[PDB]
Amino acid sequence: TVRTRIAPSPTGDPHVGTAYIALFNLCFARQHGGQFILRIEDSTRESEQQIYDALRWLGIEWDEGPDVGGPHGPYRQSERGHIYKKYSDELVEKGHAFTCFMHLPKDEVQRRLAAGESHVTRMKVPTEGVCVVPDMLRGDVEIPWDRMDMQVLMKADGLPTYFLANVVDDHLMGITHVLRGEEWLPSAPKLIKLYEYFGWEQPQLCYMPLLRNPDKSKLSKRKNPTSITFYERMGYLPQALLNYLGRMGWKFTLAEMIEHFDLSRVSLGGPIFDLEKLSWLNGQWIREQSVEEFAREVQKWALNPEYLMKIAPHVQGRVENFSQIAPLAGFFFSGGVPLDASLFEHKKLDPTQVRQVLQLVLWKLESLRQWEKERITGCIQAVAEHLQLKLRDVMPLMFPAITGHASSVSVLDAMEILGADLSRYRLRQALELLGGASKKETKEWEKIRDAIP
Amino acid sequence: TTVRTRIAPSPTGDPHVGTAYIALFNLCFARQHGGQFILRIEDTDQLRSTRESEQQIYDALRWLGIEWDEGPDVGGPHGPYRQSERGHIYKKYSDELVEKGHAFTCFMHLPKDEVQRRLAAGESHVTRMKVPTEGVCVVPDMLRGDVEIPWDRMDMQVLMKADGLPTYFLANVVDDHLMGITHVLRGEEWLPSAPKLIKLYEYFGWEQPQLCYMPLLRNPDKSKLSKRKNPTSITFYERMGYLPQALLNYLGRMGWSEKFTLAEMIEHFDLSRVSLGGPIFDLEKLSWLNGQWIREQSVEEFAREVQKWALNPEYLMKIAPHVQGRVENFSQIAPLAGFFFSGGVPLDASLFEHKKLDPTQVRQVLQLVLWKLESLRQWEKERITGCIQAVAEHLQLKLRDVMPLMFPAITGHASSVSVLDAMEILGADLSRYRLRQALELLGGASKKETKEWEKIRDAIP
């Protein structure tokens, strides 16, 4: 009986690649009457809920996990006790792993351990030869053992590595097939060797080719936004995006996808993520349904009391009649905003300095986990302070980036209401319009970013 | 689109024929329409719920041939399927009902000041549902059509208990909704309270599922099915050596329209072909049907079923040590140990004339022991012994005064292998059955005797 999983780390917005890998694991388990498992290898509970929300929004679901439960849990690493040290001790007891402070003597080792000196547990990995990874799509892949980096099992803080924990947990959860991105293929020999040290039945392996931009380059937020929630906020239908993830992989529904899913129909070249094709498909989904279904989706997306009432106070003070509301508040519904470079000619900031500020602010807001007004303000203020500018120096740059106008409703409020995705998106588009940042400016300015709270 | 049905058994003791019956219908309706069948454990009563009674539910239903698509034992995308794992979902929804004025805090009247004051002082309280007093509710029953229950009939309704747990009533509405249950088939016992269910869905502004209330299983004398007249526990029929296919088939013949498989039962399943009068549970008809299943199969299938039932190393090696010290040759084993394989035992009232207990006292002892053993969840020797001793102690009798009654009840003989060991091996259902029949033979208990002895029972450990 087939069991697949995803093991996302709860460390930020889920992205399209994660949705993609989840979809394949879901269809594969479904196709074979098996189970699909979500395991959290932890990090914040909030980022965890983001993962659940984004994937469910998409239409993906799982049979076992930390939210729905299951008879093979617990499904968060932080709830699975000392189970990892236990198996790591054994690898050490059988001479398949060693304590590192490398050297060897069990005299000095017991002594150093007794004194509570910091240490890790490393896996022994073959130094000579080639390893054959039996990939389901590619067949036999030959990776030489020499290039195989060293591998930590237990870290200095008595926590397992992602590597160790996933082998342990796949075993304990009876996972039969591991479908993962091909980013993981280089380290596959270390996985195989680990199942050998334990004496465990090794699952079937499948390494999916990477998603690529239309310029045959790897997918990156720089070239096209990757977060699932960005597409939600832009007003894409989850069925369209899910449909699109499937057509890249191997117009249809998830159920129809499962019916006609087969791994053998998957390209060995990296599928292209083409926003124009996705928009066209989404347009088709929008058209091919009743006006009533269309209305409900539009209400859920943005024309609902929760979103509108957040906007209403900021608008009530700035209009002399109701027909002046749409021009003032239209930027809350437009995805991007129309851009005008002249809106960014600062009084006492030169064009390079304007780009510098935008880049730094963008970076800090990209790192910002909790999207709240005070936290948003704190970020921009920290950047300004560190540059010996004042808050009032920087704010005029934020208004046209976020709203398309020199002045508007309170832009800090606007950013909280719009949310993280649309805010970063608009900032990035302003920055790009103005000329972006050279490879050299990126290195310089990142030193500065690092010295900023 | 996509039908989803469920059962929500409380994990409190043996699953019974009734649960099996309601399960079969929900399973068949789901299968007929391409949908899913969900098992949900409502451990709303956390103090009388056990992980072992849950396991007994899974074991008994699966033995019978009933399967589910989602549940605590298998997982599922709308879990957790145990109420006790679903967090403060219920408080959340009960809070909305108060905030939206459909439910009130009850500690009487209600001043906004005096209420906050008492809550802040940690005073005990419940949340109650607002139920209409005048007028009637129309219940859209799939089988009987519109049924009109007067609102005057509705007794008040607690949503959240003082211990912060939901009632079974609020929990199942919340969980049917969150699990997207489309059709609800339950016993007609629940029909009187149906208006409150309808009102609650209205309050949340939720789509009400289709409702169907099934007529009660009855004894052959038109009396509602009870442990009294007929044994109701699934595991009893297993231990008596009935085939689960026959019991399942019989549950289906009672329900709609004598030898059919589950797979066949689903194909020919029509909710419309269900009788509106109580289907009769007739042990003799079930037995004839079970005989036909036993007969219409290979001798090798028959043999394997008998092995699984009782002729296996596990069961026979529990018996072996007790038999070994009591025979001078192997052909004396069968007379001595036959009661391990016979179901009931042959009964002889003269076996119960006690040295120092009069006929009424014998019946009281047997009744009290039976009651306590009916309550026993963990069927183990030390615990069986503790029950009988507690009865004996409380009657100011000695254990050795009560034990002579147990031997003939359990084994059919005055003396035998150790009766306490015999009871553990035989198991809870057969022990209870045998004690009940010994009691019936001796004359049972009057209505008055029952009231009086129950008072005695409740004072016993």
Curated annotation (Swiss-Prot), chain A:
Coiled-coil ranges from the UniProt annotation: none
**UniProt entry keywords in alphabetical sequence:** Aminoacyl-tRNA synthetase, ATP-binding, Cytoplasm, Ligase, Metal-binding, Nucleotide-binding, Protein biosynthesis, Zinc
Tell me the enzyme class: ligase
Q: Which PROSITE patterns match?
A: AA_TRNA_LIGASE_I (PS00178)
Q: Record-annotated residues binding ATP?
A: K221
The protein's job, in short, is: Catalyzes the attachment of glutamate to tRNA(Glu) in a two-step reaction: glutamate is first activated by ATP to form Glu-AMP and then transferred to the acceptor end of tRNA(Glu).
Its main subcellular localisation, reduced to a broad class, is cytoplasm
This entry's comment on the bound cofactor is: Binds 1 zinc ion per subunit.
Query: How is this protein organized at the quaternary level?
Result: Monomer.
Family, as annotated: Belongs to the class-I aminoacyl-tRNA synthetase family. Glutamate--tRNA ligase type 1 subfamily.
Q: Looking at the record's lineage, which domain of life comes first?
A: Bacteria
What SUPFAM superfamilies does the annotation carry? An anticodon-binding domain of class I aminoacyl-tRNA synthetases, Nucleotidylyl transferase
Per the annotation, the residue ranges of the short sequence motif 'HIGH' region are 8-18
Q: Name one GO biological process term.
A: glutamyl-tRNA aminoacylation
Sites binding Zn(2+) sit at C100, H103
Name of the protein in question: Glutamate--tRNA ligase
From Swiss-Prot, chain B:
Kindly list the positions annotated as binding Zn(2+): C106, H109
Q: Which residues bind ATP?
A: K227
Asked if the Swiss-Prot or TrEMBL record annotates the protein with the keyword Lipoprotein, the reply is no
List cellular component terms (GO): cytosol
| Placement of sequence motif 'KMSKS' region | 224-228
Matching entries from PANTHER family are given as: GLUTAMATE--TRNA LIGASE, GLUTAMATE--TRNA LIGASE, MITOCHONDRIAL-RELATED
> What is stated as this protein's family in its record?
Belongs to the class-I aminoacyl-tRNA synthetase family. Glutamate--tRNA ligase type 1 subfamily.
Protein's recorded name:
Glutamate--tRNA ligase
Q: Which organism is it from?
A: Pseudomonas aeruginosa (strain ATCC 15692 / DSM 22644 / CIP 104116 / JCM 14847 / LMG 12228 / 1C / PRS 101 / PAO1)
